[PDB]
Amino acid sequence: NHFTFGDDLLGVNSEIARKLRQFYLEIQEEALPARLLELLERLEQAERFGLNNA
Amino acid sequence: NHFTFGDDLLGVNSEIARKLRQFYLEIQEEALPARLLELLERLEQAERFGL
Amino acid sequence: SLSTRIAPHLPYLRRFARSVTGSQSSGDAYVSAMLEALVADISIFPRASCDRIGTYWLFCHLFDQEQKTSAKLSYLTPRARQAFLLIAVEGFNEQEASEIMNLDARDFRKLLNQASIDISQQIATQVMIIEDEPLIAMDIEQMVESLGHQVVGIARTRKEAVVMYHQKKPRLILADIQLADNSSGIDAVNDILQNDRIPVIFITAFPERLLTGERPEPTFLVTKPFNPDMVKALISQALFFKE
Amino acid sequence: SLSTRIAPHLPYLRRFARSVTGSQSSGDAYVSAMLEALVADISIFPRASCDRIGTYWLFCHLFDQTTPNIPEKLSYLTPRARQAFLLIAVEGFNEQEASEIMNLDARDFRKLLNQASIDISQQIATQVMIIEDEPLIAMDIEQMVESLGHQVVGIARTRKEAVVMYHQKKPRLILADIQLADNSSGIDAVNDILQNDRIPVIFITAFPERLLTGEPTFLVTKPFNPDMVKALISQALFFK
């Protein structure tokens, strides 16, 4: 893993780390919810048309 | 898992799938490379200007 | 924009592309080409169920037009590989994966069946069983053969196991640690393992005397070697996630 | 745009938020708050080492400004300790990157991380019974268990001794050798105990010294059904 260095640093909690990584991977929806999509869209608008940048 | 239905359908290869998921998770850099970021910018511009 | 809509799927798409092609550089070249195609003509992005499906649809549509894992998945046809990975890694349901590959439901399951058979066929090998209790040995025999493996023989003693090993050259051993009234099963494995490094699974029956009705219960006991670091991490993991 | 630059980090950031807050709806509310503050004033995005670092830096900044650093799954850790642990354990950052994200110097981050690990182990420290008749094995297990901060309530050498010790001491974890003396009454002992209460058990014994040269030193046993055995075989062969 590119997690191997981090795992060695966590000692006896290395398998806790690994199972947590598996847990989050398996329960998280791969798509962003509508609200975060909308916010990205506003961020793009703020950037393009907003009064706080040029 | 939101993989449990998927693992069931894959029958005897369910642990193979689990291990592959762990492998791809462990080996992938979390940041998108510069070339893909540049393309996202050009795609944004292309839609913005209708290019 | 389409760009902000696609961007959060790219981590997932890049994994898919890497797993389908066998490397990050091939993976990323295909994802690149897909984005170049959209820069050139944004109209090729489909009206699919949702943006994730739409992005993977486009990737697969354009596609068709570590060493160990790639070696094995590369034996599948590109399409069977895609189907298997969409389910196995990418987290799609069947309805979604089939929409992505532009297949109806039956055809998508046929591809999955093909992937499954092709994987099993690739790893089918010759197996020796070390087990003196006949009912247990036959149960393991049946299980192993159901996977396409060839049982080359059932060895009942340490001496039979070593003789059989050399006459038959199995590539996998399922071994009971206990034979007769001693732990000669692990000795037999140790003798064999100086000859060759071959995978071994230590296995025996879960004792019937502890089985009842009215719950799913186990049938076998599988034993693995651990070092102290692994034991301590296991204890911590078991308590941390305790049911 | 900053928006296309931030978007590919959001799947990872949402995972981090979820893991730190304990829930997706709370993790998402914090990610939303970060995006809201950027929409209101885009100039707050840091000019940092890289976009991934700057995104997490901003998230942790906003998070720390709105979250008392007191404990309530890692909810028994302080929020800062759980951030330090998760940045390493789950998020894949190295120590230098994690410390930069948390605005800590190297020594403060190391301390925070080490304390988080200690606190995890202390949180799960418990009363442990060992069932093992061979004293050298039993002491090897006892030392591993005590090094985790557990208390060994006793070492039972027979089934009868184990059942009685179980009721007298009420251990919350059993480490059991299936084999005792010339028999397999270790598994029966565990079975007797488990009709009383549902407690974690790990079946363990030593790897025979006669087979070692100089390697594995323990054997751990687990119950399997036929499907699991078939999956294990296939997995073992696929990755050979």
Side-chain angles (χ1 to χ4, degrees), chain A residues 2-4 6-7 9-18 20-28 30-47 49-54, chain B residues 2-4 6-7 9-18 20-28 30-34 36-37 39-40 42-50, chain C residues 1-23 25-46 48-64 69-158 160-166 168-177 179-180 182-194 196 198-207 209-213 216-223 225-242, chain D residues 1-46 48-71 74-159 161-167 169-181 183-195 197 199-208 210-239:
Chain A
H2 80 72
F3 293 94
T4 53
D7 285 17
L9 195 51
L10 302 179
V12 298
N13 298 319
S14 58
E15 285 291 296
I16 286 171
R18 210 256 297 160
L20 279 177
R21 287 196 296 276
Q22 181 188 175
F23 172 74
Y24 290 119
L25 171 71
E26 279 162 9
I27 56 91
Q28 185 151 299
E30 297 91 351
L32 286 181
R35 203 218 174 168
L36 297 179
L37 287 172
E38 294 160 11
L39 281 162
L40 282 173
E41 185 160 354
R42 297 178 61 200
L43 182 59
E44 176 169 79
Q45 298 177 350
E47 199 153 7
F49 302 110
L51 304 166
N52 276 346
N53 60 281
Chain B
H2 89 262
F3 290 89
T4 61
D7 291 334
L9 181 66
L10 300 176
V12 307
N13 299 315
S14 60
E15 288 289 283
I16 287 174
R18 184 177 69 72
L20 285 172
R21 291 196 295 270
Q22 183 197 333
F23 175 71
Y24 291 119
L25 173 68
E26 289 185 324
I27 68 165
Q28 188 156 305
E30 295 89 350
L32 214 65
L36 299 187
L37 284 174
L39 280 150
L40 289 173
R42 281 162 47 201
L43 175 60
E44 181 267 352
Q45 293 169 317
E47 197 185 342
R48 179 150 143 68
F49 298 109
Chain C
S1 61
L2 187 57
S3 196
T4 57
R5 282 160 55 203
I6 286 184
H9 300 294
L10 291 186
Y12 300 94
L13 193 67
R14 293 180 58 209
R15 171 186 67 194
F16 181 58
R18 172 180 205 153
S19 66
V20 171
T21 56
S23 73
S25 64
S26 275
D28 283 356
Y30 278 100
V31 170
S32 288
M34 182 194 74
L35 297 171
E36 291 281 10
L38 285 162
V39 172
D41 182 6
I42 200 161
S43 73
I44 71 184
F45 194 86
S49 289
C50 67
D51 287 342
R52 193 181 183 214
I53 300 298
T55 306
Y56 278 69
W57 181 95
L58 181 60
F59 183 83
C60 290
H61 182 72
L62 300 175
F63 180 79
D64 296 336
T69 43
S70 165
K72 295 269 173 45
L73 288 175
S74 62
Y75 272 66
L76 279 52
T77 63
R79 296 270 284 174
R81 194 188 312 133
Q82 284 172 61
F84 176 82
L85 287 166
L86 285 166
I87 305 290
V89 175
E90 291 310 307
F92 291 108
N93 71 34
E94 259 193 289
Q95 330 196 2
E96 295 171 326
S98 78
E99 195 191 327
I100 285 159
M101 297 193 68
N102 227 92
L103 295 169
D104 76 16
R106 296 180 63 83
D107 279 339
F108 183 80
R109 208 168 292 171
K110 286 167 178 195
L111 264 189
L112 270 186
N113 293 341
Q114 187 193 113
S116 172
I117 297 302
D118 284 0
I119 293 171
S120 287
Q121 196 174 49
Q122 268 186 80
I123 66 184
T125 194
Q126 295 77 38
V127 181
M128 176 170 79
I129 295 165
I130 302 170
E131 175 62 72
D132 64 308
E133 290 284 351
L135 300 182
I136 309 180
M138 283 186 306
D139 287 352
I140 291 161
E141 175 172 348
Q142 287 172 358
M143 193 159 307
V144 162
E145 293 270 346
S146 75
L147 293 173
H149 301 301
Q150 182 182 11
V151 177
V152 299
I154 296 161
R156 298 191 305 292
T157 68
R158 168 167 178 194
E160 288 178 22
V162 303
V163 166
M164 189 177 295
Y165 173 72
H166 289 113
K168 301 288 190 174
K169 299 292 191 186
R171 306 301 309 163
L172 170 70
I173 313 304
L174 270 71
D176 201 331
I177 285 160
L179 299 176
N182 56 60
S183 288
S184 179
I186 192 154
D187 297 290
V189 164
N190 183 249
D191 304 339
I192 290 160
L193 281 171
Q194 274 111 60
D196 300 37
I198 68 166
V200 172
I201 292 161
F202 292 112
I203 183 168
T204 194
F206 189 87
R209 69 182 189 268
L210 308 181
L211 298 165
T212 78
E217 288 163 316
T219 313
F220 298 98
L221 290 163
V222 172
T223 300
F226 275 56
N227 65 33
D229 285 343
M230 295 162 68
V231 174
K232 293 182 230 186
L234 167 67
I235 289 168
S236 304
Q237 185 254 76
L239 294 173
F240 190 90
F241 294 103
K242 69 189 279 152
Chain D
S1 68
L2 183 59
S3 202
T4 58
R5 280 162 58 210
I6 289 185
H9 304 291
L10 291 186
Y12 305 93
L13 189 67
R14 289 181 66 203
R15 177 189 61 199
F16 182 56
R18 180 185 198 149
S19 70
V20 168
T21 64
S23 80
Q24 180 161 79
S25 73
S26 181
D28 288 352
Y30 276 99
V31 174
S32 185
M34 183 193 71
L35 294 174
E36 290 154 19
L38 286 157
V39 164
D41 180 2
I42 205 205
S43 77
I44 72 182
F45 198 79
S49 158
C50 70
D51 282 355
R52 188 172 193 228
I53 301 310
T55 302
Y56 277 71
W57 178 95
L58 184 62
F59 182 90
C60 293
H61 181 76
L62 293 173
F63 183 87
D64 279 354
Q65 286 184 336
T66 55
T67 308
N69 189 30
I70 58 104
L74 295 165
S75 61
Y76 54 89
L77 294 187
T78 68
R80 294 274 282 174
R82 82 168 92 100
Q83 288 177 69
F85 179 78
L86 290 159
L87 285 170
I88 302 297
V90 176
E91 301 302 318
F93 292 105
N94 69 39
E95 213 183 335
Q96 187 276 310
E97 297 168 323
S99 74
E100 178 173 11
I101 288 160
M102 295 193 73
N103 299 289
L104 294 170
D105 86 357
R107 194 170 183 88
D108 286 343
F109 181 81
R110 181 63 68 95
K111 297 180 175 176
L112 187 57
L113 178 62
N114 280 349
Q115 190 65 59
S117 315
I118 287 166
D119 289 345
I120 287 165
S121 298
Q122 295 202 329
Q123 187 71 14
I124 62 180
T126 198
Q127 294 75 47
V128 176
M129 185 175 68
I130 302 171
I131 308 181
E132 179 55 70
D133 59 322
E134 301 184 48
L136 298 182
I137 305 184
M139 292 187 288
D140 286 350
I141 295 163
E142 173 182 31
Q143 284 170 26
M144 290 191 284
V145 169
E146 301 201 338
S147 79
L148 296 164
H150 301 297
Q151 173 159 74
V152 181
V153 303
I155 302 177
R157 293 160 291 186
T158 64
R159 179 175 178 190
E161 193 175 30
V163 173
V164 175
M165 183 172 306
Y166 174 75
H167 288 109
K169 306 299 191 202
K170 307 314 302 294
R172 307 305 311 161
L173 167 69
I174 305 308
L175 270 68
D177 195 335
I178 288 166
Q179 299 250 104
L180 301 169
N183 61 54
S184 300
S185 57
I187 198 168
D188 303 272
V190 165
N191 191 251
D192 297 340
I193 290 164
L194 285 182
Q195 293 160 328
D197 320 274
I199 66 159
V201 185
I202 288 168
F203 298 104
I204 185 165
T205 188
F207 193 99
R210 71 178 183 283
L211 297 188
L212 308 172
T213 62
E215 273 167 332
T217 48
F218 294 92
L219 292 160
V220 174
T221 301
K222 178 184 175 336
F224 269 62
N225 70 34
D227 291 328
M228 290 162 76
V229 174
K230 297 188 277 202
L232 175 69
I233 295 165
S234 300
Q235 178 264 282
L237 293 179
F238 187 95
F239 297 104

